[PDB]
Design a protein around this ligand. Structure first.
Ligand SMILES: CC(C)(COP(=O)(O)OP(=O)(O)OC[C@H]1O[C@@H](n2cnc3c(N)ncnc32)[C@H](O)[C@@H]1O)[C@@H](O)C(=O)NCCC(=O)NCCS
Ligand SMILES: [Cl-]
Ligand SMILES: [Mg+2]
Length: 163
C-alpha cells in the first residue's frame, strides 16, 4: 500500500468557506492534499498569487497534511511533476458537472495516469462561489458568513486602498 496525494486546483480568488469544507473533507480521505493556486497570468485575478496563497494558508494551515503551491501551465504537467494520485474538484452545478466530465476525459487522453475525483458541496455552502463573493464585496455587501475572517479583512484593505 502506497501514499496518496491529491491536488485541488483553482484560482481561489478568494478562498471561501466552500473551498475550506472541500479541503477539510479531502484531507480525511487522502494522505496529502495540495491546494494548487493557479497564477492566472493571462486571466486577471482580483487578489495576487501571494495574497491568495496567504489567505488559503491562514484558513487551512491547521491541517497538517495540506500543502499550498502556486502553479501555471498545463494541469497535466503539474499533475506529473507532483506525482499526484488524482485531481479533486467540487461540482456545484450542472455546468460544473459537464465541464469537468469533458476536462477529465481530455486530461486522461493527454496523460493516461491522470485521475479526477469529485465532491458535492453540503447544502450550507452550495450557493457560494468566489465570483459571487467578489461581486457582493465590491457592492459593499457583508461576506462574513461565506468566507474566513482573514478574507473579510482582505476585502476591507482593498476597500481601504480605494476599491
Ligand atoms: C480551471 C482552473 C482555472 C481552476 O478552476 P476554478 O477557476 O473553478 O477555481 P475556484 O477556486 O473558484 O474553485 C475550485 C474548485 O472547487 C469548487 N468550488 C468552488 N466553490 C465551491 C463550493 N461552495 N462548494 C463546492 N465546491 C466549490 C469549484 O466548482 C472548482 O472545481 C485551473 O484548474 C486551471 O487553470 N488549470 C490549468 C490550465 C489547463 O490545463 N487548462 C485546460 C487544459 S485541461
Ligand atoms: Cl473566479
Ligand atoms: Mg468558486
Amino acid at each position: 500500500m502506497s501514499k496518496t496525494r491529491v491536488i485541488y486546483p483553482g484560482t481561489f480568488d478568494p478562498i471561501t468557506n466552500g473551498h475550506v469544507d472541500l479541503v477539510t473533507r479531502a484531507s480525511r480521505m487522502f494522505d496529502e492534499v495540495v491546494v494548487a493556486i493557479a497564477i492566472g497570468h493571462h486571466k486577471n485575478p482580483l487578489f495576487s498569487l501571494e495574497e491568495r496563497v496567504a489567505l488559503a494558508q491562514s484558513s487551512l494551515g491547521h491541517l497538517s497534511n495540506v500543502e499550498f503551491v502556486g502553479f501555471d501551465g498545463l494541469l497535466v504537467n503539474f499533475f506529473k511533476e507532483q506525482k499526484a494520485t488524482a485531481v479533486l474538484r467540487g461540482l456545484r452545478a450542472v455546468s460544473d458537472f459537464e465541464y469537468e466530465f469533458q476536462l477529465a476525459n481530455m486530461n486522461r487522453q493527454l496523460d493516461p495516469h491522470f485521475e479526477a475525483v469529485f465532491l458535492t458541496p453540503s447544502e450550507q455552502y452550495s450557493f457560494i462561489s468566489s465570483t459571487l463573493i467578489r461581486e457582493i464585496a465590491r457592492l459593499k455587501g457583508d461576506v462574513t458568513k461565506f468566507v474566513p475572517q482573514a478574507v473579510v479583512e482582505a476585502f476591507e484593505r482593498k476597500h481601504q486602498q480605494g476599491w
